[PDB]
Amino acid sequence: TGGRNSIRYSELAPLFDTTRVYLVDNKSTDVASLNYQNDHSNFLTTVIQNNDYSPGEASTQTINLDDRSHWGGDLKTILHTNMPNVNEFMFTNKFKARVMVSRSLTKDKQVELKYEWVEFTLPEGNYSETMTIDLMNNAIVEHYLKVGRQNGVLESDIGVKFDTRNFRLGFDPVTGLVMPGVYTNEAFHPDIILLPGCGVDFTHSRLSNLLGIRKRQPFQEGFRITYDDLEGGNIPALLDVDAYQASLKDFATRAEEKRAEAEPQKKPVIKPLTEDSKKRSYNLISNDSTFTQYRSWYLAYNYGDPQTGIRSWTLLCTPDVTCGSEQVYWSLPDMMQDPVTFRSTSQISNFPVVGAELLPVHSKSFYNDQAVYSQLIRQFTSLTHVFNRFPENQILARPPAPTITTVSENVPALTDHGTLPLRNSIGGVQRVTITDARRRTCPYVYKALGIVSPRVLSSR
């Protein structure tokens, strides 16, 4: 310490031992003159807080930490964003899926079904865990319109759907059917329902995470999940409720009558429904088999061979609307020594990093009353949303709203990076820069604030 303290500035007098320099954006004189063309994630600040000098002029003067000692400063920072759930940047507004795009009776008498991969995009915005799903299903439909239908494609065969129920709860081990005649619409994790000849790929989208279907060994570029993959676990068919109902015309310890009332002339059972009001085909494999051609991921993962099925190369897990906690990197190139192996440069997308921190986004959870409220309004017929374009379908229906939805929420992060080594000649104008994992500014930054407290560390 002794003679090694002195923190000096032009004529303003000797200041001794730690003090404070401030890195701020909202400084009025600065804006107008320096970072006009820049944004909150990469700006310039005049660190000289002296009322009497031009910003330019200030950019000349310097804060001089005493020369005789190696100095260090404590860097506390306040980061605040407002990035939305889905958007083009975080890759949460795009996702490739393969759908039916044409259906025509080929030249002889056999038929033709051609499929193709199309990229659907969502309208940017901050959504729910669910409404997002919906937005996706809609984006599938919206395409079926501009193309599908007007080429022999019947809704009765739209290839991909993102639903959320266990399509085999009512299932009866012997009848081979979902007895209650209705797939019990309770929500149990996002799922993916495919059809023959198609599938979906998330190779370039974090939406995968929103669904909560993660690859069992991530560092593998590429995420395609097709029909052939979802093996074992095709949605069983609903039993014909009416056919069954309409039919039926042609120890001794109180356990006596209970054992005789519980027990050629066959019944209407066997009849697995085939279509629904407005006759929508449920595409059943055989006029025999109780299983529909529709295949569910959830079903696969949980019910089909664990050592071979998707349960093998994939992993079932929690949703997370945020799509993935990603971090950001601070850099104060003009004011702090470049950490260990970092090379010193001027290429904004490669500056040295002084602090890392998670991008300020959490997921708040709320209890959903609207879960059932809706089961008592479409049972009492009325208009439809662009979401339930197939009310009477039990499959292309509208995935049940899960109780407890999550919502991406932005929050101020009063973080604190360690104490770093800094130069002893701090320039009048410092440059602040926040970067993301991929190394690029981040448009969604409303406020960055830095406070540095230099203090002597050793001697030269």
**Range 255-314, binding its own copies (CB under 8 A):** 255, 257-259, 261-262, 274-275, 279-281, 283-284, 287, 298, 301-303
> Interface with ligand C15 includes 222 (CB under 6 A)?
yes
Q: Which is nearer to ligand C15, 3 or 222 (CB)?
A: 222
**Smallest distance, its own copies to C-beta of residue 341, A:** 5
- Choosing among its own copies, ligand C15, none, which partner's interface includes residue 229 (Cβ < 5 to 8 Å by kind)? ligand C15
Between residue 303 and residue 332, which ones bind ligand C15 under the rule CB under 6 A? Answer: 313
Rounded least distance, CB 22 to its own copies, Å: 7
226 binds ligand C15 (CB under 6 A): yes
Binders of its own copies in range 189-248 (CB under 8 A): 189, 209, 212, 214, 216-221
404 part of the interface to its own copies, by CB under 8 A: yes
Binding mask 359-398 for its own copies (x = CB under 8 A): ---x-xxxxxxxxxx---------xxxx------------
Of the candidate residues 43, 227, 297, 330, the single one contacting its own copies (CB under 8 A): 43
Choose the contact partner of 222 out of its own copies, ligand C15, none; CB within 5 to 8 A by kind.
ligand C15
* By CB under 6 A, residue 357 contacts ligand C15: no
Residue 6 binding result from ligand C15, its own copies, none, given CB thresholds of 5 to 8 Å by partner type: none
Among 100, 200, 237, 354, indicate the residue that binds its own copies (CB under 8 A). Answer: 354
Of positions 114, 216, 224, 267, contacts ligand C15 by CB under 6 A? 224
Considering only residues 136 through 155, tell me which ones interact with its own copies, judged by CB under 8 A.
Answer: 138, 142, 145-146, 149-150, 152, 154
Asked if residue 421 lies in contact with residue 72, where contact means CB atoms within 8 angstroms, the answer is yes
Residue closer to its own copies (CB basis): 181 or 199: 181
Residues found near ligand C15 in the complex (CB under 6 A): 220, 222-224, 226, 228-229, 313
